[PDB]
Design a protein around this ligand. Structure first.
Ligand code: BCL
Ligand code: BCL
Ligand code: BCL
Ligand code: BCL
Ligand SMILES: CC[C@H]1c2cc3[nH]c4c(c3C)C(=O)[C@H](C(=O)OC)c4c3nc(cc4[nH]c(cc(n2)[C@@H]1C)c(C(C)=O)c4C)[C@@H](C)[C@@H]3CCC(=O)OC/C=C(\C)CCC[C@H](C)CCC[C@H](C)CCCC(C)C
Ligand SMILES: CC[C@H]1c2cc3[nH]c4c(c3C)C(=O)[C@H](C(=O)OC)c4c3nc(cc4[nH]c(cc(n2)[C@@H]1C)c(C(C)=O)c4C)[C@@H](C)[C@@H]3CCC(=O)OC/C=C(\C)CCC[C@H](C)CCC[C@H](C)CCCC(C)C
Ligand SMILES: COC1=C(OC)C(=O)C(C/C=C(\C)CC/C=C(\C)CC/C=C(\C)CC/C=C(\C)CC/C=C(\C)CC/C=C(\C)CC/C=C(\C)CC/C=C(\C)CC/C=C(\C)CCC=C(C)C)=C(C)C1=O
Ligand SMILES: CCCCCCCCCCCCCCCCCC(=O)OC[C@H](COP(=O)([O-])OCC[N+](C)(C)C)OC(=O)CCCCCCCCCCCCCCCCC
Ligand SMILES: COC(C)(C)C/C=C/C(C)=C/C=C/C(C)=C/C=C/C(C)=C/C=C\C=C(C)\C=C\C=C(/C)CC/C=C(\C)CCC=C(C)C
Ligand SMILES: CCCCCCCCCCCC[N+](C)(C)[O-]
Ligand SMILES: CCCCCCCCCCCC[N+](C)(C)[O-]
Ligand SMILES: CCCCCCCCCCCC[N+](C)(C)[O-]
Ligand SMILES: CCCCCCCCCCCC[N+](C)(C)[O-]
Ligand SMILES: CCCCCCCCCCCC[N+](C)(C)[O-]
Ligand SMILES: [Fe+3]
Ligand SMILES: [K+]
Lengths: 240, 281, 302
């Protein structure tokens, strides 16, 4: 009957839908590789889809995927075993080298832009009309790391203009330079901002931005990666 | 085999138990101590289900069914073939699910991400436990739990529901359903919105999140925003499960009559109880 | 302890955002509403503007009239007594014509006619709201994913109120307008068709419904977990994959052995959700038209 036909057709549709969905989700990261960067022998049963091209706004070009994959940066790790599937040890200081949970991707070294082509994120001092509208204003608070020592002080908030939200705290260190801290990695308290991921001595090693009133996607990745990496790599200097 | 970008993240560390002893992968899968624990609990549980099938006399996946002890056993143990297997399989399931969650926690730690995913999963675990552990214990017997079979668990859902009349009238169930439906509505809208911006009309440039906010303001006068919508899907999905668990935990324990009758507390409030007219006068 | 990014710690506000212009007729946007600090702990604080063209006004007027037609029936059933109106609010019901009227428009106001009027208004409200989801996307140069998704919901609604009654040859088959009565209708529908648990389209619909909650819990949780690297800026992660997108992928690859992309997760999402009402509408449409009893149908596989 008709119900039998409908249910049989539906499962055929669903198998086709799943094939389409899985292949769409292979537009990044594939083909799979061995640990040494060469193509793996076993790619599995789904082939790569035909490329699509996204047209990016404001003259930034296009992206075509899938396309040739590469890291575009050195990776300071080495095998710890003679066969596949074991961890790779940092060959230096993993925080400075940007590996493990301190990792960063070689994103475009330009700022993300809003829909009018202005910088998406700006220090609040240069964002006209923007101010703190609720909650404890962090500006002026001392900033404490997980060693319980003061690492610096908050001198601004960087804000997402189109979405109206706090993205980073700008923190000045003892030497008078500043660093960005991801808003999602600080706790604003009544008398301080507390940063569990980093001990005070690691603040200076947070990657710097090249221009003081904008941050490029590359730089946001280095900064956020470095701070998150501290949860694993500053664990010896943390504490209670 | 590794995704093209994967190697830099495969460093040592993050384990909760065992240091480096189980810090490795098998293909794509991370192991860890809790991966070993998962494999053990799951393997045992699956073996025991296969045995329960031999004892039941079938291999058809649509008939295999492991039933908990009948009610006469209360909270005691029961022979294997008469509820005991269920009891052990359930311990194994709990073991495997909790172990899955803790293994997710290890993966979070190695990757330097938040713990939100295992936290969310724990809500599914708590719903499962409400049905097989908490509610049975409070009601005084394992036999109030559901059986492990594809169609038999549906018989349990139907029989349990209609024990209280039309189960639609359980008010915590109404709230639960509201969250499930709202969740799906939000999921449809979120997926469509992102895709409608990433994949604009032919030859146009990708839209921005400013356009996604704009689309929603234009449509309904409000846009929750890109951070908000992810908060929202999380809240709606977890609230739906919270209220599911709640609607069951109260049923057969604090309320055990027909759910339709619970609503009489509103109808009978003194100020309008006796006014003639309407449906209830 | 560690901040979790469920609620914001600090709100910021700037000039009201009037939005992108693209091909939109600006004469038709309102001005901004108030700002809600309350909302702003969780999402955006800003309310409005909204767009209100001719279609918008039609949809709103029609929808209001649907709602008021029902409410006026409720006041009548209440004997115009406010106390009875509130006491019995969930028990009132505006019911479709009896089966003897078939698909005719001939039933008196009190015994079906008013249900039809309320329904006509709903039909206009929803379909003009649909045209609006298409047109607001079009004016901004956006894909039509929202209107396509909304159409899957419309399908179940249309089946329940309009297509299934038409094929069964009577309006008495349609859902009544009331809180409790629509639940009674739903229970009854299942009993009358031999228990919907045996309808395979209903089981699929459930699997997608539960699947939607699983996936949004997974996906919402995942984005929040990588929000420390800008994860929720999904369109730019699509355009230019960052460490947020990579860590998210790998969480899942390591956990369950495969993973999505930042764009493709949204394709898993839209389909998981639309398959709920898609499968659902099919299931309901077949009930009584082609299959009188799902237990019986299931015994015959076909
Ligand atoms: C799927 C099979 C059944 C069905 C079975 C059930 C079951 C079972 C339950 C509901 C529940 C609901 N159903 Mg129903 N319901 C059906 C089809 C519908 C249709 C329709 C087709 O137009 C509507 C409008 C509703 C509406 C409703 C709401 C009263 C409620 C929560 C819905 C929600 O969260 O969704 C989306 C969420 C949104 C936020 C968008 C919509 C917002 C509002 C709430 C909808 C307006 C409805 C009405 C005008 C409100 C009047 C309130 C006062 C009288 C003023 N149902 C079909 C016929 N429905 C739950 C409930 O609590 O009932 C008491 C419940 O447990
Ligand atoms: C005749 C039946 C009654 C009725 C009787 C009941 C009964 C009885 C129950 C419900 C419950 C529910 N009802 Mg009801 N309900 C009715 C009608 C409805 C209608 C409707 C439109 O009419 C709707 C929408 C609902 C919706 C709901 C939900 C609130 C809830 C189910 C989800 C849940 O608990 O998730 C929770 C999620 C889980 C339990 C899954 C847990 C997963 C675990 C952690 C992991 C599994 C791993 C797996 C084994 C791995 C395999 C390995 C492979 C690699 C994949 N009901 C009718 C009136 N309803 C249930 C509820 O609240 O339960 C708490 C419940 O018990
Ligand atoms: C939640 C409230 C009720 C319940 C009420 C219903 C109702 C009503 C329906 C189902 C249906 C299903 N239920 Mg149930 N179900 C319950 C609890 C469970 C549990 C559990 C471990 O707690 C499991 C594993 C299942 C599993 C199932 C599937 C067989 C089916 C589709 C689910 C789905 O797609 O979800 C979403 C999926 C995910 C989030 C991931 C997908 C997981 C896969 C599909 C699960 C396969 C599990 C496998 C068969 C178990 C074998 C274990 C082996 C030893 C490995 N239910 C409780 C008792 N369930 C539907 C059906 O068609 O039944 C025949 C149906 O109509
Ligand atoms: C005793 C009850 C019966 C039962 C009888 C039914 C009946 C009858 C139906 C379902 C349907 C469903 N059942 Mg059932 N079902 C039972 C038990 C269950 C159980 C369980 C036991 O755990 C579960 C989990 C479910 C789950 C489900 C859902 C998967 C499915 C509805 C999906 C949906 O999103 O609809 C909600 C979405 C909509 C209704 C779309 C509405 C869209 C329109 C366009 C919105 C208009 C809004 C309006 C204008 C108001 C605006 C107000 C605003 C504020 C502006 N059922 C038992 C066996 N079930 C439905 C289905 O598809 O079955 C296959 C259905 O018709
Ligand atoms: C894929 C399936 C899921 C789905 C998807 C979905 N729904 C959608 C869409 C999509 C993709 C939309 O694009 C569309 C939308 O605009 O979303 C914001 C919509 C929508 N889904 C809606 C509801 C809805 N969806 C539901 C379900 C689902 N939607 C499924 C789970 C349900 C359930 C679960 O029952 C409901 C109730 C609406 C919010 C919206 C469609 C809006 C619409 O059609 O409006 C017509 C009506 C009006 C314009 C006005 C109605 C009048 C009000 C009732 C007035 C009440 C208040 C008033 C202030 C009272 C005044 C009285 C005083 C005088 C005292
Ligand atoms: C809390 C919100 C929703 C949700 C969230 C959620 N689920 C999740 C997660 C999250 C955040 C994960 O991180 C985790 C995951 O890895 O997904 C890919 C998961 C998951 N949710 C799953 C299933 C699932 N979730 C469900 C529901 C939900 N999950 C909620 C609606 C359901 C329903 C609704 O029925 C099911 C079936 C799994 C795919 C996965 C967890 C996998 C896991 O724990 O692996 C370890 C265990 C095994 C590999 C096998 C154990 C075998 C047992 C020992 C024996 C079988 C006993 C069982 C009781 C038989 C019952 C069968 C019958 C009922 C038919
Ligand atoms: C933005 O970001 C995001 C991603 O990435 C960018 C993602 O990918 C995902 C993930 C989501 C998807 C990929 C979409 C598809 C997912 C679903 C539809 C959800 C349902 C999933 C399934 C039904 C598959 C379930 C499979 C499981 C649980 C694995 C089965 C295999 C095993 C259990 C292998 C055994 C491993 C064990 C026992 C532990 C290891 C130990 C040994 C091997 C020893 C999300 C949410 C996301 O938001
Ligand atoms: C989630 C849903 C949240 C809804 C929030 C709506 C906020 C709208 C703010 C509009 C405002 O500024 O005040 C009234 C404004 C006031 O006008 P005005 O002052 O902004 O107009 C000025 C116009 N110029 C500048 C050109 C001269 O106008 C209205 O009449 C709009 C009222 C509509 C109410 C909301 C519509 C409901 C849609 C809900 C979606 C679901 C379907 C129903
Ligand atoms: C406070 O008092 C006032 C007066 C101010 C207002 C109060 C109002 C109240 C209390 C309103 C309450 C409304 C309620 C409770 C509404 C509940 C609605 C529900 C639960 C609806 C559920 C399902 C409805 C469905 C499936 C409807 C489907 C309808 C269609 C598909 C439309 C079909 C169109 C038809 C039949 C018309 C065809 C006509 C022509 C001419 C072709
Ligand atoms: C049996 C096969 C049916 C399942 C196919 C589902 C694909 C739906 C998506 C349509 C998008 C088409 N595309 C790639 C040209 O954009
Ligand atoms: C319905 C549940 C989700 C559908 C399952 C699709 C799983 C695809 C597995 C892809 C294998 C990927 N890889 C890279 C390991 O080859
Ligand atoms: C004493 C606790 C009472 C809580 C029960 C209320 C359940 C209502 C369900 C939510 C939908 C509300 N509604 C009908 C206005 O749409
Ligand atoms: C924008 C999301 C709208 C949230 C409302 C969803 C319907 C839930 C039903 C009533 C919720 C009752 N609760 C939990 C607040 O007590
Ligand atoms: C009769 C109801 C049918 C509605 C089904 C429409 C599915 C829409 C889901 C999005 C797919 C659209 N697109 C353009 C990506 O192909
Ligand atoms: Fe998303
Ligand atoms: K400023």
């Amino acid at each position: 009957d008709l119900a039998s036909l409908a249910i049989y057709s539906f499962w055929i549709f669903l198998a086709g839908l799943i094939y389409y969905l899985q292949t769409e989700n292979m537009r990044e990261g594939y083909p799979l590789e061995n640990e040494d960067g060469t193509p793996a022998a076993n790619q599995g049963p789904f082939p790569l889809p035909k490329p699509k091209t996204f047209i990016l706004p404001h003259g930034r070009g296009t992206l075509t995927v899938p396309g040739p994959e590469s890291e575009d940066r050195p990776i300071a790790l080495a095998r710890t075993a003679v066969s596949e599937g074991f961890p790779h040890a940092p060959t230096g200081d993993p925080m400075k080298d940007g590996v493990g949970p301190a990792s960063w991707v070689a994103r475009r070294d330009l700022p993300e832009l809003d829909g009018h082509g202005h910088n998406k994120i700006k220090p609040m001092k240069a964002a006209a009309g923007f101010h703190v509208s609720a909650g404890k204003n962090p500006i002026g608070l001392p900033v404490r790391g997980c060693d319980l020592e003061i690492a610096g002080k908050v001198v601004d908030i960087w804000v997402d203009i189109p979405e109206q939200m706090a993205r980073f705290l700008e923190v000045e260190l003892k030497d008078g330079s500043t660093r960005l801290l991801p808003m999602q990695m600080v706790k604003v308290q009544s008398n301080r901002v507390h940063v569990n991921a980093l001990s005070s001595d690691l603040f200076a090693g947070i990657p710097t931005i090249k221009s003081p009133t904008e941050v490029t996607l590359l730089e946001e990745d280095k900064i956020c990666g470095y701070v998150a990496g501290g949860l694993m790599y500053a664990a010896p200097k943390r504490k209670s | 085999a590794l995704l093209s970008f994967e190697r830099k993240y495969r460093v040592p560390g993050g384990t909760l138990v065992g240091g480096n002893l189980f810090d490795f992968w098998v293909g794509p899968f991370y192991v860890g101590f809790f991966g070993v624990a998962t494999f053990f609990f799951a393997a045992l549980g699956i073996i025991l289900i296969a045995w329960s099938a031999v004892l039941q006399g079938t291999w058809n996946p649509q008939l295999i069914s492991v039933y908990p002890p009948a009610l006469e056993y209360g909270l005691g143990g029961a022979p294997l073939a008469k509820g005991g297997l269920w009891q052990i399989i359930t311990i194994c399931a709990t073991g495997a699910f909790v172990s899955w969650a803790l293994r997710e926690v290890e993966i979070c730690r190695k990757l330097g991400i938040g713990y939100h995913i295992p936290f969310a999963f724990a809500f599914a675990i708590l719903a499962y436990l409400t049905l097989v552990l908490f509610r049975p214990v409070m009601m005084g017997a394992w036999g109030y739990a559901f059986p492990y079979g594809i169609w038999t668990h549906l018989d349990w859902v139907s029989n349990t529901g209609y024990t209280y009349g039309n189960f639609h009238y359980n008010p915590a169930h109404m709230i639960a359903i509201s969250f499930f439906f709202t969740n799906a509505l939000a999921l449809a809208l979120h997926g469509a919105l992102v895709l409608s911006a990433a994949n604009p009309e032919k030859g146009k440039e990708m839209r921005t999140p400013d356009h996604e906010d704009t689309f929603f303001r234009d449509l309904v006068g409000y846009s929750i925003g890109t951070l908000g919508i992810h908060r929202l899907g999380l809240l709606l999905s977890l609230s739906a499960v919270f209220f599911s668990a709640l609607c069951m935990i109260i049923t057969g324990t604090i309320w055990f009559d027909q759910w339709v009758d619970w609503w009489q507390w509103w109808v009978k409030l003194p100020w309008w109880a006796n006014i003639p007219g309407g449906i209830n006068g | 302890a560690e901040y979790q990014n469920i609620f914001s710690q600090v709100q910021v506000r700037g000039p009201a955002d009037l939005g992108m212009t693209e091909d939109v007729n600006l004469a038709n946007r309102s001005g901004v509403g108030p700002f809600s600090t309350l909302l702003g702990w969780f999402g955006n604080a800003q309310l409005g503007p909204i767009y209100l063209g001719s279609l918008g006004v039609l949809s709103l007027f029609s929808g209001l009239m649907w709602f008021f037609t029902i409410g006026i029936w409720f006041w009548y059933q209440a004997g115009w007594n406010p106390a009875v109106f509130l006491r019995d609010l969930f028990f009132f019901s505006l019911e479709p014509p009896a089966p003897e009227y078939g698909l005719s428009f001939a039933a008196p106001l009190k015994e079906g006619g008013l249900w039809l009027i309320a329904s006509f208004f709903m039909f206009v409200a929803v379909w003009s709201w649909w045209g609006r989801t298409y047109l607001r996307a079009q004016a901004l140069g956006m894909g039509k994913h929202t209107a396509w998704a909304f159409l899957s919901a419309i399908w179940l609604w249309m089946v329940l109120g309009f297509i299934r009654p038409i094929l069964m040859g009577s309006w008495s088959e349609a859902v009544p307008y009331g809180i409790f009565s629509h639940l009674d209708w739903t229970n009854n529908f299942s009993l009358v068709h031999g228990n919907l648990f045996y309808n395979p389209f209903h089981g699929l619909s459930i699997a997608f419904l539960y699947g939607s909650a699983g996936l949004f819990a997974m996906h919402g949780a995942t984005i929040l977990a990588v929000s420390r690297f800008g994860g929720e800026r999904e369109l730019e992660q699509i355009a230019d994959r960052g460490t947020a997108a990579e860590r998210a992928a790998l969480f899942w690859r390591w956990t369950m052995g495969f993973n999505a992309t930042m764009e493709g997760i949204h394709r898993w999402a839209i389909w998981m959700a639309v398959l709920v009402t898609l499968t659902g509408g099919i299931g309901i449409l077949l009930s009584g038209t082609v299959v009188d009893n799902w237990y019986v149908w299931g015994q015959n596989h076909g």
